[PDB]
């Protein structure tokens, strides 16, 4: 139970050679800081890549409970830091050292670990006016072999997308090796995610379509905006975990996208005037989108979580999109007319190209 993680580290944290698992150590500690930010205590998180190949995550939350656990005997923090529910105990187990520092009441509680085992019990080092949780870990080279050094751009890209995915939360990334610094505090949320993806692009319409709904236990937050280009870029998420290969949520998004735009174009009479039938591929051209769904007990294809297979999430995303995208199209006719105008041109060009193949 306790030593099972050190034996098979790739099972609990992911690939230990290519750098996925090593950087996932930081993200698991960050996710716990973010979970406290979702509680409404932690307003700032400070990820720090230190000079000696170690990452720390200082937050300004209430702190990990120092309250003494009666069954175990040790503190409640030690239970969270060792006993499995991924969990921070996985990060603690696969680390040559882990410095835990908790600022709770007005007492700086400190604890050092080595390979998951604590060097001593949790003890009050000094006093403090502030409150928060700091965890600094040194990843074990026995576990992590090839990619051993932390990588700024990997932590940068994920902490930035975590800031979008967690509406109003501050993430600071500091690199003491070269003084490189970032501050991600995107208050716009997944709407601002779409802006960031479109900041170098040229949006053809101003109003970004957005919603955030909760039907049959499944949270569905979607934000999208077309651009002048012809590239589809839909970024899919399930409990803030990305999906590279897409999934059911992506399927329901695309399902509703096509139905809604076809239903609009046929009703308003755009397909009739154009003499052309539009497909999903045309509606997909130039699309940037984010689909952040919140599922309580989701199913994935594999432990990598690159594809979501929860069939309930498709129907959840599809019907919610279908109502609100249709509501968007009527309420924003200038955006609708610009978007539909691009889709008709894409449908005209495709059908003319297909007609060109057949006709000689
Ligand atoms: O309503 C309360 O009175 C309350 O505040 N309860 C509570 C319970 C448990 C608990 N655990 C936390 N851990 C963290 O925030 C964290 C872990 C890492 Br690793 C890092 Br970095 N930050 S906050 C927290 C709060």
Strand content: 25-35%
Going by CATH, what is the homologous superfamily of the largest domain?
Histidine kinase-like ATPase, C-terminal domain
Q: What is the CATH C-level name of the largest domain?
A: Alpha Beta
Helix content: 25-40%
Count of structural domains: 2
Question: Helix/strand-derived class?
Answer: alpha+beta
Tell me the number of strands.
Answer: 16
Bound molecules: ligand 6G9
Principal-axes shape call: elongated
Distance between the termini: 69 Å
* Helix-strand sequence: HHHEEHHEEEEEHEEHEEEEEHHHEEHH
Rg, alpha carbons: 24 Å
User: Which architecture of the largest domain does the CATH hierarchy give at level 2?
Assistant: 2-Layer Sandwich
Number of helices: 12
Major sheet attributes: 9 strands, mixed
Q: Predict the CATH topology of the largest domain.
A: Heat Shock Protein 90
PDB class: isomerase
Keywords: Gyrase B, inhibitor, complex, GyrB, Proteros Biostructures, isomerase, proteros biostructures gmbh
Assembly: monomeric
Entry title: escherichia coli DNA gyrase B in complex with benzothiazole-based inhibitor
């Amino acid at each position: 139970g306790l030593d099972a993680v050190r034996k098979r580290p790739g099972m609990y944290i992911g690939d230990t050679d290519d750098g996925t698992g090593l950087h996932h150590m930081v993200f698991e500690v960050v996710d716990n800081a973010i979970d406290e930010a979702l509680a409404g205590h932690c307003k700032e998180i400070i990820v720090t890549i230190h000079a000696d190949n170690s990452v720390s995550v200082q937050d300004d939350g209430r702190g990990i409970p120092t309250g003494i656990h009666p069954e175990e005997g040790v503190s409640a923090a030690e239970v969270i830091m060792t006993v499995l529910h991924v969990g921070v105990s996985v990060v603690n187990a696969l680390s040559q050292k882990l410095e835990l520092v908790i600022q709770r009441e007005g007492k700086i509680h400190r604890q050092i670990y080595e390979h998951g085992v604590p060097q001593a019990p949790l003890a009050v080092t000094g006093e403090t006016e502030k409150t928060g949780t700091m965890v600094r870990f040194w990843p074990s080279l026995e576990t992590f072999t090839n990619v051993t050094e932390f990588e700024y751009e990997i932590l940068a890209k994920r902490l930035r997308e975590l800031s979008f995915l967690n509406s109003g939360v501050s993430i600071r990334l500091r690199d003491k090796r070269d003084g490189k610094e970032d501050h991600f505090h995107y208050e716009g949320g997944i709407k601002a995610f779409v802006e960031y993806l479109n900041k170098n692009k040229t949006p053809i319409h101003p109003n970004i379509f957005y919603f955030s709904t909760e039907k049959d236990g499944i949270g569905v937050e979607v934000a999208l905006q077309w651009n002048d280009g012809f590239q589809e870029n839909i970024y899919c998420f399930t409990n803030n975990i990305p999906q590279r290969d897409g999934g059911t949520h992506l399927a329901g998004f695309r399902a509703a996208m096509t139905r809604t735009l076809n239903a609009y174009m046929d009703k308003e009479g755009y397909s009739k005037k154009a003499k052309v039938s539009a497909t999903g591929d045309d509606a997909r051209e130039g699309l940037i989108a984010v689909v952040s769904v919140k599922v309580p007990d989701p199913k994935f294809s594999s432990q990598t979580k690159d594809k979501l297979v929860s069939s309930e999430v498709k129907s959840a995303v599809e019907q919610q999109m279908n109502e609100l995208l249709a509501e968007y199209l009527l309420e924003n006719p200038t955006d609708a007319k610009i978007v539909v105008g691009k889709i008709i041109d894409a449908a005209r060009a495709r059908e003319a190209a297909r007609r060109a193949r057949e006709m000689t």
